[PDB]
Amino acid sequence: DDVTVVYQNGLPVISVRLPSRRERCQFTLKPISDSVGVFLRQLQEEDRGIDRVAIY
Amino acid sequence: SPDGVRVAASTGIDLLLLDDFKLVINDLTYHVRPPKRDLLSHENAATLNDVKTLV
Amino acid sequence: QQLYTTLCIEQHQLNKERELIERLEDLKEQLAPLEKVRIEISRKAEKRTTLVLWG
Numbered sequence: 001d002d003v004t005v006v007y008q009n010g011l012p013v014i015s016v017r018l019p020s021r022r023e024r025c026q027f028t029l030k031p032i033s034d035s036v037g038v039f040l041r042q043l044q045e046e047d048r049g050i051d052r053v054a055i056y
Numbered sequence: 057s058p059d060g061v062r063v064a065a066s067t068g069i070d071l072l073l074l075d076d077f078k079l080v081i082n083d084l085t086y087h088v089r090p091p092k093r094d095l096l097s098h099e100n101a102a103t104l105n106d107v108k109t110l111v
Numbered sequence: 112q113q114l115y116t117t118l119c120i121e122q123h124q125l126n127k128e129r130e131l132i133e134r135l136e137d138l139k140e141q142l143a144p145l146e147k148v149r150i151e152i153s154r155k156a157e158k159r160t161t162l163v164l165w166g
């Protein structure tokens with residue numbers, strides 16, 4: 001599995017695999033109104049087994 | 057999504073109702089099929105000519 | 112409402128205010144060299160006005 005970023009309706013959709021159920025999940029990002037830490041907060045809200053997140 | 061990937065809880069409803077989806081409630085998966093408009097004749101100057109004719 | 116979503120109008124409005132904020136904070140970029148001269152000129156003009164008042 002990869003992490004795929006595509007564009008739908010002018011917004012980026014990023015499809016990442018969550019660990020606790022091992023099913024993918026797509027996140028719709030807003031390129032102006034949103035930040036990195038709100039994307040990581042949504043990523044920890046979707047699955048509670050994502051205690052450690054980082055982005056480099 | 058109909059491909060099988062989950063849809064995160066920050067996705068708006070207006071982005072969700074542009075395609076089919078599946079709704080899982082406890083263990084039953086209901087295949088929701090919303091009434092969608094066309095996307096072939098959805099050139100925006102024609103959709104604005106529909107809004108102009110209706111108003 | 113199905114045109115407000117497929118044309119991505121909310122990001123267009125936020126792009127518009129981002130353009131306005133950038134134009135405002137770039138008009139304040141070429142002003143800060145000039146006020147360093149203007150404050151000097153106004154200071155050494157008030158320093159000569161108080162001379163004729165006390166005179």
Ligand SMILES: CCCCCCCCCCCCCCCCC[C@@H](O)O[C@H](CO[C@H](O)CCCCCCCCCCCCCCC)COP(=O)(O)OCC[N+](C)(C)C
Binds near residue numbers: 159162164165166
């Ligand atoms: C630049 C280098 C420094 C120079 C330092 C030397 C300064 C030399 C002095 C120059 C004087 C300029 C200031 C003028 C002060 C005079 C005050 C005047 O009021 O005295 C009157 C006496 O009159 C004076 O003899 C001259 C009258 C003024 C006519 C000349 C005008 C000079 C103005 C030059 C521009 C400078 C700006 C003015 C600064 C206030 C008596 O008061 P009063 O009778 O009860 O007036 C009634 C009050 N009103 C006006 C509000 C109704």
